Design a protein around this ligand. Structure first.
Ligand SMILES: [Mg+2]
Ligand SMILES: [Mg+2]
Ligand SMILES: [Mg+2]
Ligand SMILES: [Mg+2]
Ligand SMILES: [Mg+2]
Ligand SMILES: [Mg+2]
Ligand SMILES: [Mg+2]
Ligand SMILES: [Mg+2]
Ligand SMILES: [Mg+2]
Ligand SMILES: [Mg+2]
Ligand SMILES: [Mg+2]
Ligand SMILES: [Mg+2]
Ligand SMILES: [Mg+2]
Ligand SMILES: [Mg+2]
Ligand SMILES: [Mg+2]
Ligand SMILES: [Mg+2]
Ligand SMILES: [Mg+2]
Ligand SMILES: [Mg+2]
Ligand SMILES: [Mg+2]
Ligand SMILES: [Mg+2]
Ligand SMILES: [Mg+2]
Ligand SMILES: [Mg+2]
Ligand SMILES: [Mg+2]
Ligand SMILES: [Mg+2]
Ligand SMILES: [Mg+2]
Ligand SMILES: [Mg+2]
Ligand SMILES: [Mg+2]
Ligand SMILES: [Mg+2]
Ligand SMILES: [Mg+2]
Lengths: 107, 67, 223, 57, 96
RNA sequence: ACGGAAGGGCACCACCAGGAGUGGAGCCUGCGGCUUAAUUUGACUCAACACGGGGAAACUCACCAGGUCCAGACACAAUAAGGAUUGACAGAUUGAGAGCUCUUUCUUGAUUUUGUGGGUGGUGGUGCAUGGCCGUUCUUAGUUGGUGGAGUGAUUUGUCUGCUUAAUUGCGAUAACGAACGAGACCUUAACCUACUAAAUAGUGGUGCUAGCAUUUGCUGGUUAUCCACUUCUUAGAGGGACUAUCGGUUUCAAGCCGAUGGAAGUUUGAGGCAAUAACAGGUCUGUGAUGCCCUUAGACGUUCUGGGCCGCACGCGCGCUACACUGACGGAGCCAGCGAGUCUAACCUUGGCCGAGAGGUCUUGGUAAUCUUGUGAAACUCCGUCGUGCUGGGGAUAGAGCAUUGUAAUUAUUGCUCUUCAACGAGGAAUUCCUAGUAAGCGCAAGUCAUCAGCUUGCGUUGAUUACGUCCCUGCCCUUUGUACACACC
């Protein structure tokens, strides 16, 4: 005999959308499959990490420049569910690359 | 230039060679045809193809075409 | 604790890089290839994908014991907070890096030049690759530098399918007289792609109609 | 290598690869000193193993 | 190198415990994480211990990775006069 | 493969037709030269000269004047517990509170010292020994195999007159047929979705609470939850969309190309990423704990420490910046972007409040960030004034005097502010650069660098044209033909 609501926030962040979106729509389909109360995936502006560099190790040549970029996708989903499922839901839905973060609190 | 690559024209040839009943002078249906009837890897290439089989269609209607 | 998201994901990537280096240096004579981090609650799961795990492992479980400790003490985990595992790789023949260090170990074990690559090509092809390439760019026996293209089968070289299908590996083999470059290319058969696009974007297959017997004046059936 | 000994290269490379295929098919089946470190300096911690005195003038 | 026995032991000792040492390529660190001596003292100490075999060294990305080996085991066994079947990193932990 | 033979092409790193310029001036910045203790060095046609991400006050750093230290593994040997070796107070000394060395006399214990062998570092040489990476050829369109045809053979044909394309892109011609690499496909980004899934980290309408002006209802605000609703705008997952579409001119009525209509979009949708075979003694051992060999290794070419130098100034060259004014300068006043970035074992991005003319200071404060800085109220530009063609209030070099910030350090003035001083330049000789649409040009911004320093760079948005829609005249390459006694291939 236990259990109590919490008003939870799960943030998902990664560089491989397909996994991200995999774990993201998993959380939603799954925990709503057992009727919770949620605010669905909120996608934040996928921010872009640029790096511009001369290709040359030296100085010679037409000065070719070249930019690398890495993409940081972030999501979050809000839940209100007893302690059990949350702990269940945090340990599982594990995925190499997707960064899960679960805060608590309505403040 | 809008000259269509061989794989476009090549495939079109094949499609008309074996699916003239089915197909029309309408691109849009010729396009939806191309899905159920062939394995193309991309939307863009498929339309590039469909539009050309559609082209060769309107041509045949007013006289056979070589190949 | 307490980091930028931006700062972190980059920070992770560097962590990867250093980690993959250290193993690549450390597990050559074991045919090391790749890592994968798998972070969890309570653990961090480094998985060493070499070919000869028995050597990675060590007497009733040493060496990986050493290697853990190592990885551990440096990045400053807290004994137990990180864990290691050996995982013989499904057919080494389709890992560029696997066959790179092969030829390193071919030439370096006093082997003919073409016997090295023409072997490596043969084994790689025989392993079910759809295409393979071996550059040997360097200097052998004679003073001047040369290079040599060794290849067989089918490769593509441009755009996105490259990312998808061809694996690349360079390796610097330091011999008596100078060094040379080994450069390996495997192109994996897009057919078997499993996770991903299962062909060349080039690929346009027609489904083959059907012989039909027409005629037959109308008639309807009941049910 | 020279293009005049070429055959004998390809062949020796072919068989080189049959040798690799052999090892990898014989791999589809093929074939405690305790006391501890901090514990021996704790078990031999039973001292009377030094001396100390001085200080005068 | 030139270094008092105290700092020698604390390295040799610690090595026999962990069978593993790591340290950054930066001399003048004054004291390093884990062992209690000068960073200098560590790096060269092992280097000596390596050049007579005993232990191997490995570099990459600015940190030395030192691995004690079987012959070193007996040598350290000697320089700490511990009896055979003493210790190393050669314990399989608890059930871990 | 090459030609200082012929024939074709292709391109704003070619011209046409134009723009906006550089070339002249002041300064900024690189290169040379000169000078110097040293003024570290690489690179010299496109393809060296705001390049080595090279904005050097120490560091960096390689240069110069000097000063310490070994971080000289290991092996043999020698020394040697009657002490192999280590350290030092003060003084002398020195730039120095370096026991460097010296006076002096404790200390230290087998870690060192000495010798040889062998190692080891090195921004020492060699990029003409190499790897790797890069640049160039290349704003290019080239490479190859199966079955067949020719040839004793090396080989050729396929891969070609023509047409077409940005394209060996295609049509067509055809002893070839049918394909593969590369081009295309693909991928990323900017464009279209009142369709889909949603959002107090985005926003809308309604309602409460509430302010001002009107009152007859109205107009314009306030209130990160007082509630209800929505997803047009914003965000990003999944889809959809365009295939040069319909119609018509034009052409071997072929590939195509041109025009109108419709369309978010019809120049490869615009812009990128990727990119075959091959070539160069291109650049880089000064990015690498990549590396061969050579040199060097304790009076070091190792390293560190103090100080200078890379900035040095008769002068040649290159990239730039600011200007010569009135389509303007100033002074009020309006007031509008986008790509970014930000502090953990920390001192990053900074709102607000005060104080200070200013630069700044000071108290707090929000933000690890679609949540705070920030609506980055940016600059051109818009408006009402002042000035009125006069080197003028255009212009702001050079110079003095003061304040203040970064930093251990600001002198050879890091930067910022005030006052003053107020040059040359009145549109620039021969020459030469870049460019065809949201482009050119004008205009700021963030990011890299960064303690402090952008006259640089990489991206970004803002305002927004004139003139081509051509050609082979110039120059550059490509192709074919052709000659060759070249093949290490006209160096
Ligand atoms: Mg292709
Ligand atoms: Mg492409
Ligand atoms: Mg002209
Ligand atoms: Mg002009
Ligand atoms: Mg100057
Ligand atoms: Mg100095
Ligand atoms: Mg010696
Ligand atoms: Mg010697
Ligand atoms: Mg070096
Ligand atoms: Mg070269
Ligand atoms: Mg090279
Ligand atoms: Mg040179
Ligand atoms: Mg052009
Ligand atoms: Mg024949
Ligand atoms: Mg030809
Ligand atoms: Mg919407
Ligand atoms: Mg219209
Ligand atoms: Mg040269
Ligand atoms: Mg290099
Ligand atoms: Mg300079
Ligand atoms: Mg330049
Ligand atoms: Mg004004
Ligand atoms: Mg005052
Ligand atoms: Mg705070
Ligand atoms: Mg005046
Ligand atoms: Mg003025
Ligand atoms: Mg800046
Ligand atoms: Mg610069
Ligand atoms: Mg000839």
């Amino acid at each position: 005999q236990q259990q109590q609501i919490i008003k939870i926030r799960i943030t998902l962040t990664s560089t491989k959308v397909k996994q991200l979106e995999n774990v993201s729509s998993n959380i939603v389909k799954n925990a709503e499959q057992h009727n919770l109360v949620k605010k669905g995936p909120v996608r934040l502006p996928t921010k872009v990490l640029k790096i511009s560099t001369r290709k040359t190790p030296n100085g010679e040549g037409s000065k070719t420049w070249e930019t690398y970029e890495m993409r940081i996708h972030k999501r979050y989903i809000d839940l209100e569910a007893p302690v059990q499922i949350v702990k269940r839901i945090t340990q599982i839905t594990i995925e190499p690359g997707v960064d899960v973060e679960v805060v608590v609190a309505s403040n | 230039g809008r000259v269509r690559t061989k794989t476009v024209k090549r495939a079109s040839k094949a499609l008309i060679e074996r699916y003239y009943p089915k197909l029309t002078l309408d691109f849009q249906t010729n396009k939806r045809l191309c899905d159920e009837i062939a394995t193309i890897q991309s939307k863009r290439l498929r339309n590039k193809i469909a539009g050309y089989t559609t082209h060769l269609m309107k041509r045949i209607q007013k006289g056979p075409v070589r190949g | 604790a307490l980091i930028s998201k931006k700062r972190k994901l980059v920070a992770d990537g560097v962590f990867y890089a250093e980690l993959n280096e250290f193993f690549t240096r450390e597990l050559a004579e074991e045919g090391y290839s790749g890592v994968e981090v798998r972070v969890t609650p309570t653990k961090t799961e480094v998985i060493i994908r070499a070919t000869r795990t028995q050597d990675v492992l060590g007497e009733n479980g040493r060496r990986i014991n050493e290697l853990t400790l190592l990885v551990q003490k440096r990045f400053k985990y807290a004994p137990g907070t990180i864990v290691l595992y050996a995982e013989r790789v499904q057919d080494r023949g389709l890992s560029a890096v696997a066959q790179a260090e092969s030829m390193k170990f071919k030439l370096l074990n006093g082997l003919a030049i073409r016997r090295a690559a023409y072997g490596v090509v043969r084994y790689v092809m025989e392993s079910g690759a759809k295409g393979c390439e071996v550059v040997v760019s360097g200097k052998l026996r004679a003073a001047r530098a040369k290079a040599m293209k060794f290849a067989d089968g089918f490769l593509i070289h441009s755009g996105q399918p490259v990312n998808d299908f061809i694996d690349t590996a360079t390796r610097h083999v330091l011999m008596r007289q100078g060094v040379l470059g080994i450069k390996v290319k495997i192109m994996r058969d897009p057919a078997k792609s499993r996770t991903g696009p299962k062909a060349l974007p080039d690929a346009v297959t027609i489904i083959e109609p059907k012989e039909e017997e027409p005629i037959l004046a109308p008639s309807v059936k009941d049910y | 290598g020279d293009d005049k000994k070429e055959l004998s290269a390809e062949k020796e490379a072919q068989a080189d690869a049959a040798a690799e295929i052999a090892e990898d098919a014989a791999e589809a089946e093929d074939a405690l000193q305790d006391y501890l470190n901090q514990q021996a300096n704790n078990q031999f911690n039973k001292v009377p193993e030094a001396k100390k005195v001085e200080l005068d003038a | 190198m030139l270094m008092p026995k105290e700092d020698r032991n604390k390295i040799h000792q610690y090595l026999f415990q962990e069978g593993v040492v790591v340290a950054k390529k930066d001399f003048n660190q004054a004291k390093h994480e884990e062992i209690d001596t000068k960073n200098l003292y560590v790096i060269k100490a092992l280097q000596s211990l390596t050049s007579k075999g005993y232990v191997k060294t490995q570099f990459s990305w600015q940190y030395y990775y030192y691995t004690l080996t079987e012959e070193g085991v007996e040598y350290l066994r000697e320089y700490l006069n511990l009896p055979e079947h003493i210790v190393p990193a050669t314990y399989i932990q608890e059930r871990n």
